[PDB]
Design an enzyme around this catalytic site. Structure first.
Site, PDB file in Angstrom:
ATOM      1  N   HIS A  22       0.811  -1.225   0.000  1.00 14.94           N
ATOM      2  CA  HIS A  22       0.000   0.000   0.000  1.00 14.94           C
ATOM      3  C   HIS A  22       0.837   1.265   0.000  1.00 14.94           C
ATOM      4  O   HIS A  22       1.986   1.270   0.444  1.00 14.94           O
ATOM      5  CB  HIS A  22      -0.916   0.093   1.225  1.00 14.94           C
ATOM      6  CG  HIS A  22      -1.487  -1.215   1.661  1.00 14.94           C
ATOM      7  ND1 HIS A  22      -1.052  -1.869   2.788  1.00 14.94           N
ATOM      8  CD2 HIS A  22      -2.442  -2.002   1.115  1.00 14.94           C
ATOM      9  CE1 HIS A  22      -1.721  -2.999   2.927  1.00 14.94           C
ATOM     10  NE2 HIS A  22      -2.569  -3.106   1.922  1.00 14.94           N
ATOM     11  N   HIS A  38       1.057   4.514   2.067  1.00 13.13           N
ATOM     12  CA  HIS A  38       0.633   5.065   3.348  1.00 13.13           C
ATOM     13  C   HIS A  38       0.732   6.590   3.353  1.00 13.13           C
ATOM     14  O   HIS A  38       1.365   7.194   2.480  1.00 13.13           O
ATOM     15  CB  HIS A  38       1.440   4.456   4.494  1.00 13.13           C
ATOM     16  CG  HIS A  38       1.062   3.041   4.800  1.00 13.13           C
ATOM     17  ND1 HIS A  38       0.650   2.636   6.051  1.00 13.13           N
ATOM     18  CD2 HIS A  38       1.019   1.939   4.014  1.00 13.13           C
ATOM     19  CE1 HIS A  38       0.387   1.342   6.030  1.00 13.13           C
ATOM     20  NE2 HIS A  38       0.600   0.895   4.805  1.00 13.13           N
ATOM     21  N   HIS A  62      -3.161   3.869   5.706  1.00 10.23           N
ATOM     22  CA  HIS A  62      -3.204   3.890   4.245  1.00 10.23           C
ATOM     23  C   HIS A  62      -3.605   5.281   3.777  1.00 10.23           C
ATOM     24  O   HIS A  62      -4.465   5.922   4.382  1.00 10.23           O
ATOM     25  CB  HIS A  62      -4.207   2.867   3.699  1.00 10.23           C
ATOM     26  CG  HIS A  62      -3.911   1.454   4.100  1.00 10.23           C
ATOM     27  ND1 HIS A  62      -4.685   0.389   3.693  1.00 10.23           N
ATOM     28  CD2 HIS A  62      -2.929   0.932   4.875  1.00 10.23           C
ATOM     29  CE1 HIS A  62      -4.196  -0.729   4.204  1.00 10.23           C
ATOM     30  NE2 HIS A  62      -3.123  -0.427   4.914  1.00 10.23           N
ATOM     31  N   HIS A  94     -11.282   0.390   3.366  1.00  5.72           N
ATOM     32  CA  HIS A  94     -10.243  -0.376   2.694  1.00  5.72           C
ATOM     33  C   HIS A  94     -10.809  -1.367   1.677  1.00  5.72           C
ATOM     34  O   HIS A  94     -11.823  -2.030   1.935  1.00  5.72           O
ATOM     35  CB  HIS A  94      -9.406  -1.125   3.733  1.00  5.72           C
ATOM     36  CG  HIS A  94      -8.330  -1.974   3.140  1.00  5.72           C
ATOM     37  ND1 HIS A  94      -7.137  -1.454   2.680  1.00  5.72           N
ATOM     38  CD2 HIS A  94      -8.265  -3.311   2.928  1.00  5.72           C
ATOM     39  CE1 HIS A  94      -6.390  -2.435   2.198  1.00  5.72           C
ATOM     40  NE2 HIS A  94      -7.056  -3.572   2.329  1.00  5.72           N
ATOM     41  N   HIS A 113      -9.288   2.714  -0.491  1.00  5.37           N
ATOM     42  CA  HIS A 113      -8.370   3.829  -0.267  1.00  5.37           C
ATOM     43  C   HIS A 113      -7.545   4.093  -1.524  1.00  5.37           C
ATOM     44  O   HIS A 113      -7.228   3.163  -2.264  1.00  5.37           O
ATOM     45  CB  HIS A 113      -7.388   3.460   0.846  1.00  5.37           C
ATOM     46  CG  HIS A 113      -8.029   3.119   2.160  1.00  5.37           C
ATOM     47  ND1 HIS A 113      -7.521   2.148   3.001  1.00  5.37           N
ATOM     48  CD2 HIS A 113      -9.090   3.658   2.804  1.00  5.37           C
ATOM     49  CE1 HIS A 113      -8.258   2.091   4.098  1.00  5.37           C
ATOM     50  NE2 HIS A 113      -9.212   3.003   4.007  1.00  5.37           N
ATOM     51  N   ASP A 148      -4.564   1.648  -1.864  1.00  2.00           N
ATOM     52  CA  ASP A 148      -4.793   0.197  -1.846  1.00  2.00           C
ATOM     53  C   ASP A 148      -4.341  -0.513  -3.120  1.00  2.00           C
ATOM     54  O   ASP A 148      -5.077  -0.571  -4.105  1.00  2.00           O
ATOM     55  CB  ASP A 148      -6.271  -0.089  -1.588  1.00  2.00           C
ATOM     56  CG  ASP A 148      -6.681   0.239  -0.176  1.00  2.00           C
ATOM     57  OD1 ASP A 148      -5.770   0.424   0.669  1.00  2.00           O
ATOM     58  OD2 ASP A 148      -7.901   0.297   0.093  1.00  2.00           O
ATOM     59  N   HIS A 188       3.904  -5.643   3.472  1.00  2.00           N
ATOM     60  CA  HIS A 188       3.519  -6.285   4.727  1.00  2.00           C
ATOM     61  C   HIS A 188       3.939  -7.746   4.819  1.00  2.00           C
ATOM     62  O   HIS A 188       4.177  -8.404   3.805  1.00  2.00           O
ATOM     63  CB  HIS A 188       2.007  -6.193   4.903  1.00  2.00           C
ATOM     64  CG  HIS A 188       1.539  -4.807   5.187  1.00  2.00           C
ATOM     65  ND1 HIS A 188       1.262  -4.361   6.461  1.00  2.00           N
ATOM     66  CD2 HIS A 188       1.362  -3.746   4.366  1.00  2.00           C
ATOM     67  CE1 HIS A 188       0.905  -3.089   6.409  1.00  2.00           C
ATOM     68  NE2 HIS A 188       0.962  -2.692   5.151  1.00  2.00           N
ATOM     69  N   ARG A 196       4.375  -4.424   9.202  1.00  2.00           N
ATOM     70  CA  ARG A 196       5.042  -3.713   8.126  1.00  2.00           C
ATOM     71  C   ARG A 196       6.476  -4.228   8.002  1.00  2.00           C
ATOM     72  O   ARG A 196       7.281  -4.063   8.920  1.00  2.00           O
ATOM     73  CB  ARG A 196       5.013  -2.213   8.427  1.00  2.00           C
ATOM     74  CG  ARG A 196       3.594  -1.696   8.611  1.00  2.00           C
ATOM     75  CD  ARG A 196       3.504  -0.243   9.018  1.00  2.00           C
ATOM     76  NE  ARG A 196       2.108   0.109   9.267  1.00  2.00           N
ATOM     77  CZ  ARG A 196       1.643   1.346   9.392  1.00  2.00           C
ATOM     78  NH1 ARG A 196       2.467   2.378   9.294  1.00  2.00           N
ATOM     79  NH2 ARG A 196       0.347   1.547   9.613  1.00  2.00           N
TER      80      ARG A 196
HETATM   81 CU    CU Z   1       0.294  -0.994   4.090  1.00  2.00          CU
HETATM   82 ZN    ZN Z   2      -6.394   0.495   2.544  1.00  2.00          ZN
END
Ligand code: CU
Ligand code: ZN
Ligand code: CU
Ligand code: ZN
Lengths: 156, 156
Positions: free
Chosen positions: A45, A47, A62, A70, A79, A82, A119, A145
Site C-alpha cells: 500500500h 501510506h 493507508h 479499505h 483507499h 490500496d 507487509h 510492516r
Molecule cells: Cu500498508
Molecule cells: Zn487500505
C-alpha cells in the site's frame, strides 16, 4: 511526464519501486521488485506519511484522501493507497507490475513524499468477515510492516 | 501547519532534519543534527530530486525553480535550495537551526519529495573567484556529497 521512486528498507525485506505517469490524465504505472519476502502473497500500500524516524510505524495509515474504507485495487470502494497483494516466488522475490487510476504524481492528492509499505501478511482486500471484519475495512488484516520507503521525485 | 523530515544516509555521515512551516505564508524552520562530519564547515542544500537509486548522485543539482545562480542563504541571488554551511564541532556533530523564505512545504515549488544533501567541503556561497568562479556559481565548490535523504511528509 513525471517519475518517482521508493527505495524500500527493512530489517530483512528490501526493494525498489518506480512510478511513472505520462500526464495528470494518465494512469500511474507502478513497477519494481521486492526481495527477502516469504513465498506467497503480501499486502502492498501507499501510506499517508513518508516519515521514517520511527521505522515503518511513522508512515501512518493507508493514504485515504477521499475518506473511503479499505479495499483491493479492483474494488469500487477503496483507499487511494490500496494496491492489493504482491506475490513472492520461491526465492523470496516479488516482481511488481501494476497500473492505478487513483494513485497520481500530479496535483493536490499526489503521493510524492508519502510512503510505500509492504507487509508480512496477505491483504484480505476489505472482504474479511466475523471478528476480522472491522480490521478488514481499515487495513485488510495484512499484518506487520516489513519494509517501507519514501516516494521520491526522480528525473523524468 | 505542515511538517517534513529527511533522514540523511551516507557511508559515514548520517542525520535527521525536520522542516516545519505554520502556513504557506510563513518561513520554513529547518532544524536537526548531522553526525560523522569532519570538524568545520560543510555545504548543505536542497537538491532537485529525492531519487537515491544511485546514492547521492541521483539527487541531481541544487533545487532551482527560479533559474538563479548559486549563493548563500543571505544572498540576493541564490537557488531555492541554498542553505549555506553547517558547522560540525570537535565530535563531528553539526547542530542545525535555520529559517528560510524560499524553501516551502506548500504549493507548486514545494521541496517535499526532493532531497537534502550535506557535503564534504565548505560552500563558498557563490563568491569564488578566478578558476573557482564558474563552479562557484553552480555548486559553491562544496565538493563531494557525504549524505542525502528524501524530504518526506510527516504528521503535523
Ligand atoms: Cu500498508
Ligand atoms: Zn487500505
Ligand atoms: Cu548540495
Ligand atoms: Zn546552489
Amino acid at each position: 511526464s513525471n517519475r518517482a521512486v521508493a527505495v524500500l528498507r527493512g530489517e530483512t525485506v528490501t526493494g525498489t519501486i518506480w512510478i511513472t505517469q505520462k500526464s495528470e490524465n494518465d494512469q500511474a504505472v507502478i513497477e519494481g521488485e521486492i526481495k527477502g519476502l516469504t513465498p506467497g502473497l503480501h499486502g502492498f500500500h501507499v501510506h499517508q506519511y513518508g516519515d521514517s524516524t520511527n521505522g515503518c510505524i511513522s508512515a501512518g495509515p493507508h493514504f485515504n484522501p477521499f475518506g473511503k474504507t479499505h479495499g483491493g485495487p479492483k474494488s469500487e470502494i477503496r483507499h487511494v493507497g490500496d494496491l492489493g497483494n504482491v506475490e513472492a516466488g520461491a526465492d523470496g522475490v516479488a516482481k511488481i507490475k501494476l497500473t492505478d487510476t487513483l494513485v497520481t504524481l500530479y496535483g493536490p492528492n499526489t503521493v510524492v513524499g508519502r510512503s510505500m509499505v509492504v507487509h508480512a501478511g496477505q491483504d484480505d482486500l476489505g472482504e474479511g468477515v466475523g471478528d476480522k471484519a472491522e480490521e478488514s475495512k481499515k487495513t485488510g488484516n495484512a499484518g506487520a510492516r516489513a519494509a517501507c520507503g519514501v516516494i521520491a521525485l526522480a528525473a523524468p
